Amino acid sequence: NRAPTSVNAQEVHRWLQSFNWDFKNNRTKYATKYKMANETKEQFKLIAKEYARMEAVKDERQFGSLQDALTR
Amino acid sequence: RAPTSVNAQEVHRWLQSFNWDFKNNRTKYATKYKMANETKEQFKLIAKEYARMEAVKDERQFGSLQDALTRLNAGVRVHPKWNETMKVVSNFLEVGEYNAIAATGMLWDSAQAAEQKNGYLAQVLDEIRHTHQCAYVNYYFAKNGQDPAGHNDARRTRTIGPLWKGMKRVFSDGFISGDAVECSLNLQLVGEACFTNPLIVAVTEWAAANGDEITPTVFLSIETDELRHMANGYQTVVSIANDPASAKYLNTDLNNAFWTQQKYFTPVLGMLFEYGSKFKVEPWVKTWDRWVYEDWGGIWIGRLGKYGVESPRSLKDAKQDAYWAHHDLYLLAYALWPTGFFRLALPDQEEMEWFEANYPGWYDHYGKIYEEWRARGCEDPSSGFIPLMWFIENNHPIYIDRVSQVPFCPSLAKGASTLRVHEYNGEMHTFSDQWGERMWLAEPERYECQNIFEQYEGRELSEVIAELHGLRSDGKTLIAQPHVRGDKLWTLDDIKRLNCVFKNPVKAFN
Amino acid sequence: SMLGERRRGLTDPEMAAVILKALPEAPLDGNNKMGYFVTPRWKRLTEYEALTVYAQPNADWIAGGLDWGDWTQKFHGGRPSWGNETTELRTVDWFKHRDPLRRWHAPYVKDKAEEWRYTDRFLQGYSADGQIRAMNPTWRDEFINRYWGAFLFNEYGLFNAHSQGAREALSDVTRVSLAFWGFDKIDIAQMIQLERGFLAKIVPGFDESTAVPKAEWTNGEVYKSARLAVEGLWQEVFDWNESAFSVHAVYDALFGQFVRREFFQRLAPRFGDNLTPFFINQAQTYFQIAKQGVQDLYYNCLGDDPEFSDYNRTVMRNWTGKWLEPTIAALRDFMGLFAKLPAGTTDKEEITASLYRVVDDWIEDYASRIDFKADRDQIVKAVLAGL
Amino acid sequence: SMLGERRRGLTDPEMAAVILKALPEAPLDGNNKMGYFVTPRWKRLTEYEALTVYAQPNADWIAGGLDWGDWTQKFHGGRPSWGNETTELRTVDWFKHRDPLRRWHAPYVKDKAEEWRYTDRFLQGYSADGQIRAMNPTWRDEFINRYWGAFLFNEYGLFNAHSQGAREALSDVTRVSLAFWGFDKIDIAQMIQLERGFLAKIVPGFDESTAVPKAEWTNGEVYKSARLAVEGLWQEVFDWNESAFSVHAVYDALFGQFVRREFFQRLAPRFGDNLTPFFINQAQTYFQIAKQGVQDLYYNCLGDDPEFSDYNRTVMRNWTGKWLEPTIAALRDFMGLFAKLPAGTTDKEEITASLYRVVDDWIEDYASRIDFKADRDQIVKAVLAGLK
Amino acid sequence: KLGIHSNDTRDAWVNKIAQLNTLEKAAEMLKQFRMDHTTPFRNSYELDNDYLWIEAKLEEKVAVLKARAFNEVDFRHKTAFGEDAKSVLDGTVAKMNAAKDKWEAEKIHIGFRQAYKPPIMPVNYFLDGERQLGTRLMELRNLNYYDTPLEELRKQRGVRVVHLQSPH
Numbered sequence A: 001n002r003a004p005t006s007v008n009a010q011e012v013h014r015w016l017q018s019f020n021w022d023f024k025n026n027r028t029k030y031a032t033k034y035k036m037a038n039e040t041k042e043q044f045k046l047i048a049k050e051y052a053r054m055e056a057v058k059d060e061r062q063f064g065s066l067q068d069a070l071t072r
Numbered sequence B: 001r002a003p004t005s006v007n008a009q010e011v012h013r014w015l016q017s018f019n020w021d022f023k024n025n026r027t028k029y030a031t032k033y034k035m036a037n038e039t040k041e042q043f044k045l046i047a048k049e050y051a052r053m054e055a056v057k058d059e060r061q062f063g064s065l066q067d068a069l070t071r072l073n074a075g076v077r078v079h080p081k082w083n084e085t086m087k088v089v090s091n092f093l094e095v096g097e098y099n100a101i102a103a104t105g106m107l108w109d110s111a112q113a114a115e116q117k118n119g120y121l122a123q124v125l126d127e128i129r130h131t132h133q134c135a136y137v138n139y140y141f142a143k144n145g146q147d148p149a150g151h152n153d154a155r156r157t158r159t160i161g162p163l164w165k166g167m168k169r170v171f172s173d174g175f176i177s178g179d180a181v182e183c184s185l186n187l188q189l190v191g192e193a194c195f196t197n198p199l200i201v202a203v204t205e206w207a208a209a210n211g212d213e214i215t216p217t218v219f220l221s222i223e224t225d226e227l228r229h230m231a232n233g234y235q236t237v238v239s240i241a242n243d244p245a246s247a248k249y250l251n252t253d254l255n256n257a258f259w260t261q262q263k264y265f266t267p268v269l270g271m272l273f274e275y276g277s278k279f280k281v282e283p284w285v286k287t288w289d290r291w292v293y294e295d296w297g298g299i300w301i302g303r304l305g306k307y308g309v310e311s312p313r314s315l316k317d318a319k320q321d322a323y324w325a326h327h328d329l330y331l332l333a334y335a336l337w338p339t340g341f342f343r344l345a346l347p348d349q350e351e352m353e354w355f356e357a358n359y360p361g362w363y364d365h366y367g368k369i370y371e372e373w374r375a376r377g378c379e380d381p382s383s384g385f386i387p388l389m390w391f392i393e394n395n396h397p398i399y400i401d402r403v404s405q406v407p408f409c410p411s412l413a414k415g416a417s418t419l420r421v422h423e424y425n426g427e428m429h430t431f432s433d434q435w436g437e438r439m440w441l442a443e444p445e446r447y448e449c450q451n452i453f454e455q456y457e458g459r460e461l462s463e464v465i466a467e468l469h470g471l472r473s474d475g476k477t478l479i480a481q482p483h484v485r486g487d488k489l490w491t492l493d494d495i496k497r498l499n500c501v502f503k504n505p506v507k508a509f510n
Numbered sequence C: 001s002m003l004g005e006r007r008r009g010l011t012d013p014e015m016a017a018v019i020l021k022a023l024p025e026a027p028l029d030g031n032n033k034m035g036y037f038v039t040p041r042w043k044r045l046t047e048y049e050a051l052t053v054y055a056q057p058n059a060d061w062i063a064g065g066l067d068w069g070d071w072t073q074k075f076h077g078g079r080p081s082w083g084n085e086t087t088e089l090r091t092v093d094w095f096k097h098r099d100p101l102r103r104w105h106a107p108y109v110k111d112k113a114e115e116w117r118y119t120d121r122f123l124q125g126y127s128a129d130g131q132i133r134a135m136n137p138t139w140r141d142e143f144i145n146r147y148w149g150a151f152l153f154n155e156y157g158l159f160n161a162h163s164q165g166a167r168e169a170l171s172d173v174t175r176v177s178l179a180f181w182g183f184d185k186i187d188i189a190q191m192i193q194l195e196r197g198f199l200a201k202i203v204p205g206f207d208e209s210t211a212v213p214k215a216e217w218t219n220g221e222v223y224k225s226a227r228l229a230v231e232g233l234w235q236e237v238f239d240w241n242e243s244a245f246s247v248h249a250v251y252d253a254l255f256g257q258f259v260r261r262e263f264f265q266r267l268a269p270r271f272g273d274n275l276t277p278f279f280i281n282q283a284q285t286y287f288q289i290a291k292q293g294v295q296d297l298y299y300n301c302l303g304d305d306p307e308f309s310d311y312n313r314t315v316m317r318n319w320t321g322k323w324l325e326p327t328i329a330a331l332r333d334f335m336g337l338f339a340k341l342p343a344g345t346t347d348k349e350e351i352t353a354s355l356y357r358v359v360d361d362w363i364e365d366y367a368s369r370i371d372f373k374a375d376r377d378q379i380v381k382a383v384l385a386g387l
Numbered sequence D: 001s002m003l004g005e006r007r008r009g010l011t012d013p014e015m016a017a018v019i020l021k022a023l024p025e026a027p028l029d030g031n032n033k034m035g036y037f038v039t040p041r042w043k044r045l046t047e048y049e050a051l052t053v054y055a056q057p058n059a060d061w062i063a064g065g066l067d068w069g070d071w072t073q074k075f076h077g078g079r080p081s082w083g084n085e086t087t088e089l090r091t092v093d094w095f096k097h098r099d100p101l102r103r104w105h106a107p108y109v110k111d112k113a114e115e116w117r118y119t120d121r122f123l124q125g126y127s128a129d130g131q132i133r134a135m136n137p138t139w140r141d142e143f144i145n146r147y148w149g150a151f152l153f154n155e156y157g158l159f160n161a162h163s164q165g166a167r168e169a170l171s172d173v174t175r176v177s178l179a180f181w182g183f184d185k186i187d188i189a190q191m192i193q194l195e196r197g198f199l200a201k202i203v204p205g206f207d208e209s210t211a212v213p214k215a216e217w218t219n220g221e222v223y224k225s226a227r228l229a230v231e232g233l234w235q236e237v238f239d240w241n242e243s244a245f246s247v248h249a250v251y252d253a254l255f256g257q258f259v260r261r262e263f264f265q266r267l268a269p270r271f272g273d274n275l276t277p278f279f280i281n282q283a284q285t286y287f288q289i290a291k292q293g294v295q296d297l298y299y300n301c302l303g304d305d306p307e308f309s310d311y312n313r314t315v316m317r318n319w320t321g322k323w324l325e326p327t328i329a330a331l332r333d334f335m336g337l338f339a340k341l342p343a344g345t346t347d348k349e350e351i352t353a354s355l356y357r358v359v360d361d362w363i364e365d366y367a368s369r370i371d372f373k374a375d376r377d378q379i380v381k382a383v384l385a386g387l388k
Numbered sequence E: 001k002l003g004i005h006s007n008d009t010r011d012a013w014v015n016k017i018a019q020l021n022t023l024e025k026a027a028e029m030l031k032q033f034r035m036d037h038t039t040p041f042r043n044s045y046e047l048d049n050d051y052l053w054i055e056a057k058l059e060e061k062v063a064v065l066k067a068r069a070f071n072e073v074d075f076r077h078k079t080a081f082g083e084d085a086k087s088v089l090d091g092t093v094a095k096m097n098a099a100k101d102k103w104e105a106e107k108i109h110i111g112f113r114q115a116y117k118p119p120i121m122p123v124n125y126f127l128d129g130e131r132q133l134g135t136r137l138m139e140l141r142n143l144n145y146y147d148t149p150l151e152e153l154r155k156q157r158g159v160r161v162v163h164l165q166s167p168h
């Protein structure tokens, strides 16, 4: 089957939690009275590539309006 | 190991050598000329780089539209008269942009030098960019404007009216039908150089004056692509300057191209500008003279003199018929208002003062007629009156020029009032000037376009309108209107009651 | 002045007031959907369709048109601006086609511009990373400068084959796709020359002149039949559909796919060449992009036309038979290039297998759609006669 | 309604009139150049410089600052928000650095977004062109899923090493570069996982779970020392410059360049793999991009500082010696992977040559800049000992 | 009954076409239709508003019939009348080059279209001829295009001047 396929952000983010591994000095370098659960999950399933793409789309409009219509 | 790459010009350097010699390596299109197969293009571009510079331009444009301009509600805060005018200006230009696609594809076929083919090819893709840009203007005004009808279906509702036919001649067929070089002169040496380039900027001026910031945003972007289409039209003359056939045919095709274009735009652009706006920028007479007479007929045509190019012989004629042409045409456009896809308005007082001021003699002719019409209730749907009736009552027939498709009324005109009627093999033909008449006589098979009176003959008005979908979403109210106010819009029924039936004005010579 | 001379109707108090005063209380029509009358290919009308479909002013006498009447100005002799007479194919509607990628101008230049800018970045990383060191000199100076370089004229010629289609296409949707198919071909050809120009900057002795590769193309043996088929598709075919169909659904699907993928993409790696594959990646992306469009036009729209399905399939089978032969000849002559490779580079088994891949994919995506009875063993064996 | 309720000062007649009426005849100052007081690195001030330099509110007591006085709120104990105490390096001005690529946020996400969208296009062309057929099963299921996959944790760890720098960096220009260097590392790591997820969709049996490659990284032999060096650079170094410098000018310039370029980029082709090289092309572009910035900060600005040139070179030589050893250990253990390759894939000669390339480029672009006396034969021979 | 796109006249022809089931019959009807209703030399203008649409619907039938009747080689090289396309092309180009004046030329070009326009002749040869014939026609026509005054030109065209008006 040679159907056109690819992979998106969430499909990779699914395994991001497992990226970190256990070892001796794997701990914060900053003083703190609290202990952040090391199994916490983030709400938005993003990866660097996808993050960049959604911020770039936003930039186009913004700078477009400024350099063009708004300047005119 | 220093970071290096390669740019466009570094590759373009070898593009001329891309083409190779062989038997049938020649044009597939008929042409009297021979384009030197060593011609060079002015801009050293490659597909990748072309795409990049056009894409950067798109970002700004669409960014302004989707963002700041939408937040400011620029699609609405525009004068009603102009919202209507842009239905015609943008869609009519769209087909010019679109046929220019096929036209430059034909020129890319005609060119033999790899660099000249590539030059045309850049336009082939630009014209697609412009077809889509013009389309976007109507798309934007439809989605966010004060009246989407017309903007949302001009591609089909434009077929009802007579003004569209003339548009297809100068910006559709005049672009692709005939000798490749003749089409090139129509499109590039005349169309773009003389009218399109100055016009696109003009439109942005009138737009700005009437609250429209959408068109400026898009058209000023289209404008940035025009310096390439000028170089292509210029390089067409170079590629054929050394061919012996050029000294025999070049000036004849250039003259026919000039006349063909000016015949339509001289009266149509001025009409759209002065009558389709509330706020004025500058009198069309003054504009025309600068464009056609000075900048083009003098400056641009003068530089091509060293290639055998001379000033069009019909230039004086064009100038003398031009003065009142647009005023003469609006009378016809308004009188036939039910055949359009946009709403028209009569000159308010401030405007009439402006017209008379800039066109002495205006009020006694057009001014009084418009007042006469408004008095009978041409704006009110209960009056049972349509200016077309006034033309009939006062015996002022309206003919369609068999060649240019431009509507004309010689019995009432203030500009050209010539009329030539001929019969040939069982068919009657009407001409409005000596140049178009020669064209037909010499090339009768090139001009067999049926006019609205021929096609609509014996048909009741409301039936032609309904058949061609000239209604709004309510299936009741007409798209076209004789005023630009929000109340008292004419309905299909209001038109049916008039019981107006079309007649071929030429059958009278029987 | 800081404020400027020209007053604008959107911001000028006096003028804006006049404008606002003339506006109606609400839109004079609630149907703000431009192109609302177009029949959607998908669930909802797309921006691509709204901005494209019906931009071509065709009259009802050209399947699908909405206008009426003859053209206003025609060719000497009477030939129409656009007519049914420019192609043997017939349909119920020329505006039925749809580019599955829904590409109108903006998206098209956007994607290509991204590729161009990344290509720049890539080359600058490549040259700085000094990878050219690990590349075999013979493969570089021989197969890249000469044979891959010669292939640029092949792509250039296929590009030109689209010139008449750009002019004759019978609908906007088809004209735009066609235009893009050919613009991608000239791009690939220019990318081939870009690589040769790049190598010239990092390899002290590499001549970027097109002289050598051009001589190979014009007078060589490897590409002789390839060039003969190209000159034919380009200048001997006057039917715009036969041109597009034969180029993409026959010649380039077989010969082009073999040269690009089965020869250079497959072997460049084996010679320390990761450069050429960068560009071939683009050409293949483009090829697969164009294929979706080609299939929709010739198979989904024409080949399956509810009225001329039969007729059209007959004509396309005819064209496939007409061009399958010259295409086989091109492949055969190309087989001669394997004898030039250093010993042990590849064997008759790999070569036969790769040929079968190209032919099977072809029968796969093209031949079977119009019921063209193709014999894989026959085709391959005919080409094999070339080693 | 059609006109909207809210009235805007730019378009509302009444309000706009009031505004226009209050405007002066001309600007109250003709110097419309924001950041005009910044010293340009190039001929003219760049947008990148104007929008970046001096955004960090440093006081004069932190080399280069323009403010005065202590921070308003500090850490319990008294530690300042930012201070000279967070790095051993010293300079005349922390705002001297300049990213040669002049990357501020907009351009950065623009370029990355282009790469992302093309990557999508590429994969869809690749899958449709059916090229996966010609790829060797063993190389695919073995070296890509297991060993290349394990390398993702290496890049992930290098990414995390930048966390403290993101917080301690002593200037905006340095903070932005640092942030971007690390963001590119997490990206590469995610691209490795993207390839494994892609293969899972076209290869009927490929498990994308990170379990196998993770076990290889956590308990394997091939990457044992590599992982030990990574855990160290990340969690044992509290000096933000030592972290950035050691990671980019030592560990990743030697180990990373060897694994990415001299192993996977060099051999994947030989196995019908044109997929992995697509991604490694990006990683190498990123590496070469970061190097320009790393060199400017540690060599052009600090190593050549008109006042602390001597001091800084000493400290960087110290750090190079400190991390060159663990990096050599990482390379050595990695040599163990060649014994896993099918016979005839490569020989001891190719391997030695490629190692010499990595070491010579390193002496080239890094070691020689701080006058660190490096012996190529010694380094290579030490790594060579890892060959089974 | 009455309509621009749909009318009784058009429906009439649709039926007449549905009755053609022989390549020869249909092909003959098309050539006749072209002689009767197309070009400035058409036998009559009675179908001026529908001929273009009707002719296409007619070409459709001749096309389908031809495809089912001809073999591959013939479909590519023969006209629906069994003639050898190339022979017709080369033959017509011969007469065009042996054209003494622009008046003889236009007759050759226009007649060529009425007789061989696809689906009669294969498009490849047709458009090929279209390029050769058109080129000659223009060379003759655009030579001293404005020398002949309108009064004289109207006479050469042989038109019947029904009315002239000119204040200048």
Ligand SMILES: [Ca+2]
Residues within 6 Å of the ligand: D221, D224, D333
């Ligand atoms: Ca060990």
Ligand SMILES: [Ca+2]
Residues within 6 Å of the ligand: D347, D349
């Ligand atoms: Ca050896």
Ligand SMILES: [Fe+3]
Residues within 6 Å of the ligand: B097, B100, B126, B127, B130, B222
């Ligand atoms: Fe344009």
Ligand SMILES: [Fe+3]
Residues within 6 Å of the ligand: B100, B192, B226, B229
């Ligand atoms: Fe243009």
